[PDB]
Amino acid sequence: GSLQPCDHPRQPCDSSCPCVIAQNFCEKFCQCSSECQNRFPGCRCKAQCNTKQCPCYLAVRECDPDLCLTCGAADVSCKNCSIQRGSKKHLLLAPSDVAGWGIFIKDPVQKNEFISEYCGEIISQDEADRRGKVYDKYMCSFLFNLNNDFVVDATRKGNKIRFANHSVNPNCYAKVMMVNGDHRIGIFAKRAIQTGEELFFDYRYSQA
Ligand SMILES: [Zn+2]
Ligand SMILES: [Zn+2]
Ligand SMILES: [Zn+2]
Ligand SMILES: [Zn+2]
Ligand SMILES: [Zn+2]
Ligand SMILES: [Zn+2]
């Protein structure tokens, strides 16, 4: 059960806690003490927080304003707070070099660098399969597979990066990240990308 808070009033998060059994950190939604030993401790980085040297970056979570007290998360020296702050690289929507409409990056990025949140509704494959066969009011829809269980629907609540085209050889990928207790989708560069290049995702399975 993904994102299930534990709730065992007056009891600690021991080997009887579902979070501990399933081997996941206790999160913001869990009813346990803020001092719970099964919670994520955050980081004490000096800045950046964009390499495996950062505990938060490594655990696929953004830094936490009330836990990451040195890196800049509580203040833009921390580069692991972008989804929270609504920060992103500059992107251009333009006619694709391939065909139709495309997204072109306007800032250079390095391999594994954050580009933008991919906004939308995270839904199950079941809910996606429904929307797919059922009569819909929206004409032009935007959806891709995160993995084999979940899809992002960017039709109603998407942002500009939803216009990025499909490729089985993509230059970008998606991370499902823990962001202040919620799962949010980050788009990262799969390789170094120069300014003016078109961005591509693998729609089959974007979570690389
Ligand atoms: Zn617990
Ligand atoms: Zn818990
Ligand atoms: Zn706990
Ligand atoms: Zn850090
Ligand atoms: Zn941190
Ligand atoms: Zn940080």
Numbering used by the authors: 523 to 597, 604 to 736
Q: What's in the article?
A:
Methylation of histone (H3K27) by PRC complexes is believed to be catalyzed by its conserved SET-domain containing member, Enhancer of zeste [E(z)]. EZH2 is the human homolog of E(z), the C-terminal SET domain of which is the most conserved region of the protein by primary sequence. Unlike other SET domains, i.e., SET7, SET8, and SUV39H1, EZH2 is inactive on its own and requires binding partners (SUZ12 and EED) for activity.
EZH2-SET crystallized in the space group P212121 with one copy per asymmetric unit. Found within the pre-SET domain N-terminal to the SET domain, there are two three-atom clusters of bound zinc coordinated by two distinct nine-residue constellations. The core of the SET domain is formed by a three-stranded (β-3, β-7, β-8) anti-parallel β-sheet pressed diagonally across a second smaller three-stranded (β-4, β-5, β-6) anti-parallel β-sheet. Unlike many of its homologs, the C-terminal Post-SET domain of EZH2 does not encode a zinc-binding motif and is largely disordered in the crystal structure. Rather than looping outward and downward after the conserved tyrosine at position 731 to form the lower lobe of the SAM cofactor binding site, the C-terminus turns upwards and packs against the loop between β-strands 5 and 6 and the outer edge of β-7 with the backbone oxygen of the C-terminal Y731 forming a hydrogen bond with the backbone nitrogen of β-5 N673. When compared with structurally homologous SET domains, it appears that the conformation of the C-terminus in this position would impair both cofactor and substrate binding. The Y646, F672, F729, and Y731 aromatic side chains form a tightly packed hydrophobic core which occludes the lysine substrate binding channel. In those structures, the C-terminal post-SET domain forms part of the cofactor binding site without a zinc stabilized motif.
